[model samples]
Target: GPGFDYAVAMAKRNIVTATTSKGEFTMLGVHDNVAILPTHASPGESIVIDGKEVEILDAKALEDQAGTNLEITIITLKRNEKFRDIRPHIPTQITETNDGVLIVNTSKYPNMYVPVGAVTEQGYLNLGGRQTARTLMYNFPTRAGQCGGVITCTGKVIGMHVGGNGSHGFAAALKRSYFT
Candidate 1:
């Protein structure tokens, strides 16, 4: 699946992993977001192997552990490094949303870029109506041979996996609210 390919590629590239209770986890370079396969655990639980946690913090911990500012900082830095290296090789165009969100749109797969933010913001929106916007900040290709579609690792639907001609892939950003 597209998501799996991306994760494998990140592993091959040796992207740095962030610290978490589970240990060091790789960050998918394509999307500034971390990829935790559903096979790891059910929705409200962390992946525990032999009594040792393999998954990072649960959704709630992720939201509470780092506020929006920290989450944004981590994502932005990681994404910036990824984009800096791959931008030349790929033809995707990166743009910022009105609210400073990042959107990466590619000529071959324009719809894949989805709005993503820190867990805090996502939570705020779920409580009621906070405020949000669609934006493009970085661009990178899914691992080679990993076509955009449903992300296999997370078992989540990729609403707008295709990109080209302003398709603006699925509105997956709103789905982030559910994670919290």
Candidate 2:
């Protein structure tokens, strides 16, 4: 947020909604299967929603699927799959900093900045009784705010919300894969 343009950033945000073979879900980006989601949303081999469809071509788990492998899995969507409004936040570059990050609260909470000491300490996060690859945490003070958010710092898209409620949350950052 230090020098980032919030307006332009929000224009790049999107919510991935789909009707999977199992059910439906509104994923915050994408990551380990945990956190508050649709009542019974579970992804299947392929997904269809709003006339758009994507087949989960391949899912490669993290190296240490046991310990930290739960970090973020590489999901290969079918090349022919057509994604509607979900403009995945695949950043080309990011950095570590004590400087605060801009929380792009597009349609959820009013856009705000999670200042230094108010965010996660660049550590591994836990959800629904499980562990994931180490990630950044943006602990909003009120702890009662949630949104389809993106983490940007120094004018660069640094991170994204993988899952969380109003009081707490977890996300993956510097996901270069999302870029190219």
Candidate 3:
């Protein structure tokens, strides 16, 4: 039911095309670039690229299955359309946990945890560690398409598409510039 709802909602929106050398590919949304591989393989598989082994998580099917050379790049969309309208919905003050975890209260669903070393580049004091320094927060709808299944922003990728309800989730706490 939830998946159907999400699919219907997505269908109603105008799809954006991903810029490729041979014209473009119609993408459902920002993170829809990920390829849906068989469940036998996990995300973040190690592969050989340019005579070196590289670990890639989301684009495995595109690279290994479709024979496309995966190149990671940051494409800034016009008007910051992803998070611009949703900023107001995010909590102004994140709830801090005893173990130093931060929780963001969402209007719908349960409150989401701000993973350790999650905040970056917002000029917040470096309380987590070196990992969190200069990191950008991705604030988008929790859906599968691009940025893996997570609501990815610039620096941090939240997790795989848990479902349409944004119930279960995961995030990879990594620097944004690394992919860019």
Point out the worst 10-residue segment of candidate 3 by lDDT.
156-165
Return the TM-score for each candidate structure: 0.22, 0.53, 0.21
The clash count for each model shown is: 16, 5, 12
Task: Please write out the lDDT profile of model 1 over residues 24-65, one tens digit for every residue.
Answer: 222323333334221111223343322344333323212223
Better of 1 and 3 by TM-score: 1
Q: Rank the candidates by lDDT, best first.
A: 2, 3, 1
The global Cα lDDT (0 to 1) of model 1 is: 0.26
Q: How many Å off is the CA of 7 in candidate 1?
A: 7.6
The C-alpha RMSD of each candidate to the native structure, in angstroms, is 13.8, 7.0, 15.2
Q: How would you encode candidate 2's per-residue C-alpha lDDT over 103-154 as one tens digit per residue?
A: 5432244345555334444556564466655467656533323332445554
TM-score of 1: 0.22
Per-residue alpha-carbon lDDT of model 3 for 51-89, expressed as tens digits?
A: 334344434221213432122222322222332122222
User: Against the true structure, candidate 2 has what lDDT?
Assistant: 0.45
Task: In angstroms, give how far residue 135 of model 2 lies from its true place.
Answer: 2.1
Candidate with the greatest lDDT versus the true structure: 2
How far residue 84's Cα lies from its native spot in candidate 1, in Å, is 9.5
lDDT of 3: 0.26
